[PDB]
């Protein structure tokens, strides 16, 4: 009642999209260090008993296709769903290797009414990406 | 008998709206480094929002950018937890 039921046969999937190299038109330099993140996440979620699937350097079209396919799987025996996005970004946008795609397009596939086998189950999207170009100068404490 | 179609989503953003997110070429991104560390240390006990709150503190206090370009030097970062969750989330199960 107060806590999500996490005793289904499987914790669920953990989809990791690791974009490191981009098309010059994006003006994004290689995301050095992202492989460390990808490996760290793989191990971390493996220990949490998630079925991890790592995908590297996906175009914006491939990201959409992957998400669509995953949302069409039968998640009935899974307690939750996790998707980790590692890439360049802008507010409300994540970058495929060849260009931007709205995050809303990606998450919509999992809406309570579009992915019935995940209805009532926690859907987590972990996003490592810029959301603009403002910097935080901080304040001394 | 019905729930919102937007319910039960949790968006753990590495940074606040409109801001840069930092990544170290050798150690990885500040956010993912911290997220994995807090999950490894607390997933067997704490509820997810509380783990993410510790991630916020770790990123906010232990990291500061270093750059030869003054424009990108001494910068800070705070992650952004966006929850439409309706229940507490634990990665453990009492049987």
């Amino acid at each position: 009642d107060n806590s999500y039921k996490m005793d289904y046969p499987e914790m669920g999937l953990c989809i990791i999209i690791n974009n490191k190299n981009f098309h010059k038109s994006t003006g994004m330099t290689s995301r050095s260090g992202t492989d460390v993140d990808a490996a760290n996440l793989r191990e971390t979620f493996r220990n949490l008993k998630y079925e991890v699937r790592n995908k590297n350097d996906l175009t914006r079209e491939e990201i959409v296709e992957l998400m669509r396919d995953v949302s069409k799987e039968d998640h009935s025996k899974r307690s939750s769903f996790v998707c980790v996005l590692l890439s360049h970004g802008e507010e409300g946008i994540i970058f495929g290797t060849n260009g931007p795609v709205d995050l809303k397009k990606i998450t919509n596939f999992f809406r309570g009414d579009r992915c019935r086998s995940l209805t009532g189950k926690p859907k987590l999207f972990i996003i490592q990406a810029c959301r603009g170009t403002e910097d935080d100068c901080g304040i001394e404490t | 008998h019905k729930i919102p179609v937007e319910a039960d989503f949790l968006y753990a953003y590495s940074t606040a709206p409109g801001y840069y997110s930092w990544r170290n070429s050798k150690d990885g991104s500040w956010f993912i480094q911290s997220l994995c560390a807090m999950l490894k240390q607390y997933a067997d006990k704490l509820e997810f929002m509380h783990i993410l709150t510790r991630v916020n503190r770790k990123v906010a206090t232990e990291f500061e950018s270093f750059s030869f370009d003054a424009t990108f030097h001494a910068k800070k970062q705070i992650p952004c937890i966006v929850s439409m969750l309706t229940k507490e989330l634990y990665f453990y199960h009492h049987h």
Partner: peptide
């Protein structure tokens, strides 16, 4: 350190 680099920015995403």
């Amino acid at each position: 350190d680099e920015v995403x």
